[PDB]
């Protein structure tokens with residue numbers, strides 16, 4: 259408040275409003291995110307938004323998650339202080355500009371995504387909204403960072419019957435039954451994401467295509483990549499790969515380091 263210098267609004271949406279900021283104490287770049295208390299669906303613990311509980315559980319030590327540095331409670335909103343990489347661009351914008359990604363780049367991005375989601379999972383947190391817009395690229399370090407835990411939940415082994423993430427990334431068992439388990443629904447969304455990365459667009463727009471589960475490639479994509487995608491997008495949850503199987507898949511071998519990724523691909 260006196261502790262942060264606010265700059266430009268970065269965006270707004272169902273997550274609230276995110277401003278670029280600086281922490282005055284040491285000039286650290288931050289993102290400052292406000293949600294209205296009324297617009298908060300889900301709470302935990304003092305009563306904080308679930309997002310804060312989930313962020314505190316994943317923000318310890320380092321990872322591929324944008325870390326929560328601090329939060330404040332205002333009379334009708336909560337304010338989250340988050341890390342801000344600089345320069346940064348979300349993976350959606352990045353794909354809009356460059357179109358479908360070279361596989362070497364998608365492999366590096368995808369792997370970093372998988373490490374970040376494993377970390378969330380090891381921490382007891384299910385993100386539930388993995389997609390291009392929720393992934394930030396630190397364009398100098400080539401490091402990807404998960405954002406927006408606002409639809410996430412504690413990880414658990416029983417079935418989830420609520421979902422408020424992105425539909426076109428939701429699995430067919432959610433579409434048909436409003437039931438999914440955490441890991442396998444995450445894996446499906448990783449399949450959409452991987453397809454999006456290598457094709458330049460998500461594979462399915464309509465409930466029907468999701469449920470049909472048939473994947474058509476519109477760009478040239480290697481067979482190993484199409485196979486990994488189709489495995490993530492297995493119609494039966496239990497036919498999907500574990501994170502381990504995904505990272506042991508042949509398309510995933512020999513990943514570039516993040517730094518290499520930036521040098522070759524991001525300049």
Ligand SMILES: O=C(c1ccco1)c1c[nH]c2ccccc12
Nearest residue numbers: 268273276289324341342405406
């Ligand atoms: O954390 C973020 C976020 C976006 C939506 C919900 O949380 C950020 C959105 N744009 C950003 C830019 C830099 C760091 C975080 C974010």
